[PDB]
From a paper:
Among the most effective bacterial resistance mechanisms are β-lactamases, a family of enzymes that are divided into four distinct classes. Classes A, C and D (serine-β-lactamases, SBLs) use a catalytic site serine residue to initiate inactivation of the antibiotic, while Class B (metallo-β-lactamases, MBLs) relies on a Zn2+-activated hydroxide. MBLs contain catalytic centres that can accommodate two closely spaced Zn2+ ions bound in the α and β sites with similar yet distinct sequence motifs (B1: His116, His118, His196 and Asp120, Cys221, His263 (i.e., HHH/DCH) for the α and β sites, respectively; B2: NHH/DCH; B3: HHH/DHH). For B3-type MBLs two variations of the canonical active site motif have been observed, QHH/DHH in GOB-1/18 from the opportunistic pathogen Elizabethkingia meningoseptica and HRH/DQK in SPR-1 from Serratia proteamaculans (variations shown in bold).
B3-RQK MBLs have three distinct aa variations in the active site motif, including two in the β site. We determined the crystal structures of the mature CSR-1 protein and CSR-1trunc, and compared them to structures of B3 and B3-Q MBLs. However, no metal ions were observed in the crystal structures of CSR-1 and CSR-1trunc, suggesting reduced metal ion affinity. To probe the role of these residues single, double and triple mutants of CSR-1trunc (i.e., CSR-1trunc,sm, CSR-1trunc,dm and CSR-1trunc,tm) were generated to create variants where either the α, the β or both metal binding sites are identical to the canonical B3 MBL motif. These mutations had no significant effect on the overall structures, however, in CSR-1trunc,sm electron density indicates the presence of one bound Zn2+ in the α-site, while in the double and triple mutants both the α- and β-sites are occupied by Zn2+ ions. The increasing Zn2+ binding capacity of CSR-1trunc as a function of introduced mutations was paralleled by enhanced ex vivo and in vitro activities, especially for the double and triple mutants; importantly, these two variants are also resistant to CA. Thus, the variations in the β-site of B3-RQK MBLs are responsible for the loss of catalytic activity and sensitivity to CA. When the weaker bound metal was removed (from the β site), a stable enzyme-inhibitor complex was only formed in CSR-1trunc and CSR-1trunc,sm, indicating that CA inhibits B3-RQK MBLs by displacing Zn2+ from the low affinity β site. Mutation of the B3-RQK active site to restore the native B3 motif resulted in increased metal affinity, catalytic activity and resistance to CA. This can be primarily attributed to the restoration of the canonical histidine in position 263 of the β-site, and raises the possibility of modifying CA to effectively bind in the presence of His263, thereby increasing the therapeutic range of this widely used antibiotic resistance drug.
Numbering used by the authors: 15 to 273
The structure:
Amino acid sequence: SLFEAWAKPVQPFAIWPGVWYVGTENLSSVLLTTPQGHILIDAGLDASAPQIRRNIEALGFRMADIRYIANSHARLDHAGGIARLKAWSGARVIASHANAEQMARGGKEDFALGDALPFPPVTVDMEAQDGQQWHLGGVTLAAIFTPGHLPGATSWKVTLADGKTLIYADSLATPGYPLINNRNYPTLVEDIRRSFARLEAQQVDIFLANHGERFGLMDKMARKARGENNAFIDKAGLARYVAQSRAAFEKQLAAQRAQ
Ligand SMILES: [Zn+2]
Ligand SMILES: [Zn+2]
Ligand SMILES: [Zn+2]
Ligand SMILES: [Zn+2]
Ligand SMILES: [Zn+2]
Ligand SMILES: [Zn+2]
Protein backbone atom coordinates (compact mmCIF):
# COMPACT_ATOMS: atom_id res chain seq x y z
CA SER A 1 0.00 0.00 0.00
CA LEU A 2 3.07 2.22 0.17
CA PHE A 3 3.56 1.41 -3.51
CA GLU A 4 -0.13 2.30 -3.89
CA ALA A 5 0.60 5.78 -2.52
CA TRP A 6 3.76 6.00 -4.63
CA ALA A 7 1.78 5.07 -7.76
CA LYS A 8 -0.96 7.70 -7.38
CA PRO A 9 -1.30 9.37 -10.80
CA VAL A 10 -0.02 12.83 -11.68
CA GLN A 11 -1.02 14.83 -14.74
CA PRO A 12 1.92 14.67 -17.19
CA PHE A 13 3.81 17.87 -17.87
CA ALA A 14 6.90 19.39 -19.46
CA ILE A 15 10.04 19.51 -17.33
CA TRP A 16 11.94 21.33 -20.11
CA PRO A 17 11.82 21.57 -23.94
CA GLY A 18 11.94 17.93 -24.99
CA VAL A 19 11.79 16.52 -21.44
CA TRP A 20 8.43 15.23 -20.21
CA TYR A 21 7.38 13.70 -16.90
CA VAL A 22 4.99 10.77 -17.36
CA GLY A 23 5.46 8.98 -14.04
CA THR A 24 3.47 8.94 -10.82
CA GLU A 25 3.58 10.94 -7.59
CA ASN A 26 6.79 9.28 -6.37
CA LEU A 27 7.86 6.83 -9.13
CA SER A 28 9.57 8.70 -11.94
CA SER A 29 9.20 8.05 -15.66
CA VAL A 30 10.78 10.51 -18.09
CA LEU A 31 10.12 10.79 -21.83
CA LEU A 32 12.77 12.47 -23.98
CA THR A 33 11.30 13.37 -27.37
CA THR A 34 13.23 14.00 -30.60
CA PRO A 35 12.31 14.16 -34.32
CA GLN A 36 13.89 10.69 -34.74
CA GLY A 37 12.04 8.94 -31.91
CA HIS A 38 11.83 9.02 -28.15
CA ILE A 39 13.58 7.68 -25.06
CA LEU A 40 11.75 6.54 -21.92
CA ILE A 41 13.75 6.38 -18.68
CA ASP A 42 12.23 3.87 -16.24
CA ALA A 43 8.63 2.65 -16.13
CA GLY A 44 7.35 2.09 -12.60
CA LEU A 45 5.13 -0.69 -11.34
CA ASP A 46 3.47 -3.14 -13.71
CA ALA A 47 0.09 -1.91 -12.45
CA SER A 48 0.97 1.62 -13.62
CA ALA A 49 1.97 0.67 -17.17
CA PRO A 50 -1.45 1.60 -18.66
CA GLN A 51 -1.21 4.97 -16.90
CA ILE A 52 2.25 5.62 -18.35
CA ARG A 53 1.21 4.90 -21.94
CA ARG A 54 -1.94 6.91 -21.24
CA ASN A 55 0.22 9.80 -20.07
CA ILE A 56 2.47 9.63 -23.14
CA GLU A 57 -0.55 9.74 -25.46
CA ALA A 58 -2.17 12.56 -23.47
CA LEU A 59 0.91 14.66 -24.28
CA GLY A 60 0.51 14.00 -28.01
CA PHE A 61 3.14 11.30 -28.54
CA ARG A 62 2.97 7.74 -29.82
CA MET A 63 4.20 4.57 -28.12
CA ALA A 64 5.44 3.30 -31.49
CA ASP A 65 7.88 6.23 -31.68
CA ILE A 66 9.69 5.23 -28.46
CA ARG A 67 12.98 3.68 -29.59
CA TYR A 68 14.71 3.01 -26.26
CA ILE A 69 13.63 2.21 -22.70
CA ALA A 70 16.38 2.75 -20.12
CA ASN A 71 16.32 1.24 -16.62
CA SER A 72 17.94 2.61 -13.47
CA HIS A 73 17.78 -0.54 -11.31
CA ALA A 74 15.87 -3.78 -11.69
CA ARG A 75 13.31 -3.75 -8.91
CA LEU A 76 9.55 -3.66 -9.28
CA ASP A 77 9.10 0.07 -8.60
CA HIS A 78 11.14 0.97 -11.71
CA ALA A 79 11.31 -2.10 -14.00
CA GLY A 80 7.88 -3.57 -13.23
CA GLY A 81 6.19 -1.94 -16.20
CA ILE A 82 8.97 -2.34 -18.76
CA ALA A 83 7.72 -5.67 -20.13
CA ARG A 84 4.34 -4.28 -21.19
CA LEU A 85 5.75 -0.90 -22.25
CA LYS A 86 8.32 -2.75 -24.36
CA ALA A 87 5.53 -4.78 -25.99
CA TRP A 88 3.41 -1.70 -26.74
CA SER A 89 6.60 0.08 -27.82
CA GLY A 90 8.62 -2.19 -30.03
CA ALA A 91 11.43 -0.36 -28.24
CA ARG A 92 14.77 -1.86 -27.24
CA VAL A 93 15.57 -1.98 -23.53
CA ILE A 94 18.92 -0.68 -22.26
CA ALA A 95 20.34 -1.78 -18.91
CA SER A 96 23.55 -2.81 -17.18
CA HIS A 97 24.60 -6.45 -16.97
CA ALA A 98 23.42 -6.98 -13.39
CA ASN A 99 20.10 -5.26 -14.12
CA ALA A 100 19.70 -7.41 -17.23
CA GLU A 101 20.25 -10.58 -15.21
CA GLN A 102 17.73 -9.62 -12.53
CA MET A 103 15.15 -8.44 -15.06
CA ALA A 104 15.30 -11.79 -16.87
CA ARG A 105 14.59 -13.33 -13.44
CA GLY A 106 11.53 -11.15 -12.86
CA GLY A 107 13.27 -9.48 -9.94
CA LYS A 108 13.92 -12.79 -8.18
CA GLU A 109 17.12 -13.74 -6.36
CA ASP A 110 17.59 -10.11 -5.33
CA PHE A 111 20.74 -9.93 -3.21
CA ALA A 112 18.73 -8.40 -0.34
CA LEU A 113 15.03 -9.12 -0.96
CA GLY A 114 15.31 -12.64 -2.38
CA ASP A 115 12.10 -13.59 -4.18
CA ALA A 116 9.90 -11.23 -2.18
CA LEU A 117 9.05 -8.69 -4.92
CA PRO A 118 8.83 -10.21 -8.41
CA PHE A 119 7.61 -8.55 -11.59
CA PRO A 120 7.15 -9.56 -15.25
CA PRO A 121 10.50 -10.66 -16.69
CA VAL A 122 12.13 -8.65 -19.47
CA THR A 123 14.81 -9.47 -22.04
CA VAL A 124 17.31 -6.61 -22.24
CA ASP A 125 18.12 -5.90 -25.89
CA MET A 126 21.22 -3.72 -25.40
CA GLU A 127 23.63 -4.26 -22.53
CA ALA A 128 24.97 -0.96 -21.22
CA GLN A 129 28.58 -0.47 -20.14
CA ASP A 130 29.86 2.37 -17.99
CA GLY A 131 30.11 5.59 -19.98
CA GLN A 132 28.49 4.09 -23.09
CA GLN A 133 26.62 6.61 -25.23
CA TRP A 134 23.52 6.50 -27.43
CA HIS A 135 22.63 9.26 -29.89
CA LEU A 136 19.13 10.01 -31.16
CA GLY A 137 17.79 13.12 -32.88
CA GLY A 138 20.40 15.45 -31.43
CA VAL A 139 20.11 14.05 -27.90
CA THR A 140 22.85 12.02 -26.22
CA LEU A 141 22.12 9.46 -23.49
CA ALA A 142 25.07 8.27 -21.40
CA ALA A 143 25.13 5.58 -18.71
CA ILE A 144 26.71 6.40 -15.35
CA PHE A 145 27.11 3.19 -13.34
CA THR A 146 26.21 4.03 -9.72
CA PRO A 147 26.07 0.67 -7.91
CA GLY A 148 25.35 0.23 -4.22
CA HIS A 149 21.58 0.21 -3.89
CA LEU A 150 21.80 -2.71 -6.33
CA PRO A 151 24.85 -4.21 -8.06
CA GLY A 152 23.63 -2.85 -11.40
CA ALA A 153 22.20 0.51 -10.32
CA THR A 154 22.64 2.95 -13.20
CA SER A 155 22.29 6.73 -13.36
CA TRP A 156 21.67 8.43 -16.69
CA LYS A 157 23.25 11.57 -18.13
CA VAL A 158 21.36 13.26 -20.96
CA THR A 159 22.83 16.03 -23.12
CA LEU A 160 19.79 17.77 -24.59
CA ALA A 161 19.68 19.25 -28.08
CA ASP A 162 19.96 22.75 -26.58
CA GLY A 163 23.20 21.78 -24.82
CA LYS A 164 21.87 21.59 -21.26
CA THR A 165 22.81 18.60 -19.12
CA LEU A 166 20.24 16.42 -17.35
CA ILE A 167 21.14 13.85 -14.70
CA TYR A 168 18.62 11.13 -13.80
CA ALA A 169 19.97 9.74 -10.54
CA ASP A 170 19.40 6.25 -9.21
CA SER A 171 18.72 5.53 -5.55
CA LEU A 172 21.64 5.29 -3.13
CA ALA A 173 19.59 4.00 -0.18
CA THR A 174 20.67 1.01 1.88
CA PRO A 175 17.94 0.56 4.53
CA GLY A 176 18.36 -2.70 6.39
CA TYR A 177 21.38 -3.72 4.31
CA PRO A 178 24.20 -5.73 5.90
CA LEU A 179 27.14 -3.55 4.90
CA ILE A 180 30.08 -5.46 6.44
CA ASN A 181 31.10 -8.59 4.53
CA ASN A 182 27.73 -8.93 2.82
CA ARG A 183 27.58 -12.53 1.59
CA ASN A 184 25.47 -11.80 -1.50
CA TYR A 185 27.06 -8.44 -2.46
CA PRO A 186 30.58 -8.29 -1.01
CA THR A 187 31.64 -5.19 -2.99
CA LEU A 188 28.74 -3.04 -1.76
CA VAL A 189 30.71 -0.53 0.31
CA GLU A 190 33.48 0.18 -2.20
CA ASP A 191 30.79 0.28 -4.90
CA ILE A 192 28.66 2.94 -3.20
CA ARG A 193 31.76 4.98 -2.32
CA ARG A 194 32.78 5.05 -5.99
CA SER A 195 29.19 5.99 -6.85
CA PHE A 196 29.27 9.02 -4.54
CA ALA A 197 32.53 10.17 -6.13
CA ARG A 198 31.20 9.61 -9.65
CA LEU A 199 28.00 11.58 -9.09
CA GLU A 200 29.51 14.49 -7.14
CA ALA A 201 31.96 15.07 -10.01
CA GLN A 202 29.02 15.45 -12.43
CA GLN A 203 27.81 18.90 -13.48
CA VAL A 204 24.09 19.26 -14.12
CA ASP A 205 21.49 21.81 -15.17
CA ILE A 206 18.35 19.70 -14.63
CA PHE A 207 18.47 17.29 -11.69
CA LEU A 208 16.08 14.33 -11.64
CA ALA A 209 15.87 11.13 -9.60
CA ASN A 210 13.80 7.97 -9.87
CA HIS A 211 11.83 8.98 -6.74
CA GLY A 212 10.04 12.32 -6.84
CA GLU A 213 10.51 13.13 -3.15
CA ARG A 214 14.29 13.27 -3.71
CA PHE A 215 14.33 16.07 -6.31
CA GLY A 216 11.28 18.03 -5.13
CA LEU A 217 8.95 16.86 -7.87
CA MET A 218 5.65 18.19 -6.51
CA ASP A 219 7.07 21.56 -5.45
CA LYS A 220 8.85 22.20 -8.75
CA MET A 221 5.79 21.00 -10.67
CA ALA A 222 3.46 23.45 -8.91
CA ARG A 223 5.98 26.28 -9.36
CA LYS A 224 6.27 25.63 -13.10
CA ALA A 225 2.48 25.47 -13.47
CA ARG A 226 2.27 28.94 -11.91
CA GLY A 227 4.66 30.32 -14.54
CA GLU A 228 8.18 29.57 -13.26
CA ASN A 229 9.61 28.33 -16.55
CA ASN A 230 12.93 27.22 -15.03
CA ALA A 231 11.66 25.52 -11.87
CA PHE A 232 13.48 22.26 -12.68
CA ILE A 233 16.82 23.96 -13.33
CA ASP A 234 18.63 22.87 -10.15
CA LYS A 235 22.42 23.08 -10.44
CA ALA A 236 22.98 22.15 -6.77
CA GLY A 237 20.49 19.28 -6.76
CA LEU A 238 22.95 16.45 -7.39
CA ALA A 239 25.58 17.69 -4.93
CA ARG A 240 22.93 17.89 -2.19
CA TYR A 241 21.52 14.48 -3.17
CA VAL A 242 24.97 12.92 -2.83
CA ALA A 243 25.86 14.77 0.37
CA GLN A 244 22.68 13.66 2.15
CA SER A 245 22.89 10.07 0.90
CA ARG A 246 26.56 9.83 1.88
CA ALA A 247 25.93 11.33 5.32
CA ALA A 248 23.22 8.77 6.06
CA PHE A 249 25.32 5.90 4.67
CA GLU A 250 28.42 6.70 6.73
CA LYS A 251 26.32 7.00 9.90
CA GLN A 252 24.69 3.64 9.15
CA LEU A 253 28.08 2.05 8.46
CA ALA A 254 29.62 3.56 11.60
CA ALA A 255 26.80 2.04 13.65
CA GLN A 256 27.33 -1.38 12.05
CA ARG A 257 31.07 -1.35 12.81
CA ALA A 258 30.50 -0.39 16.47
CA GLN A 259 29.41 -3.87 17.63
ZN1 LIG B 1 15.18 0.58 -5.26
ZN1 LIG C 1 12.93 -0.78 -3.12
ZN1 LIG D 1 12.73 2.82 -6.10
ZN1 LIG E 1 26.31 -9.24 -19.43
ZN1 LIG F 1 23.47 -13.90 -18.38
ZN1 LIG G 1 14.20 -18.07 -6.13
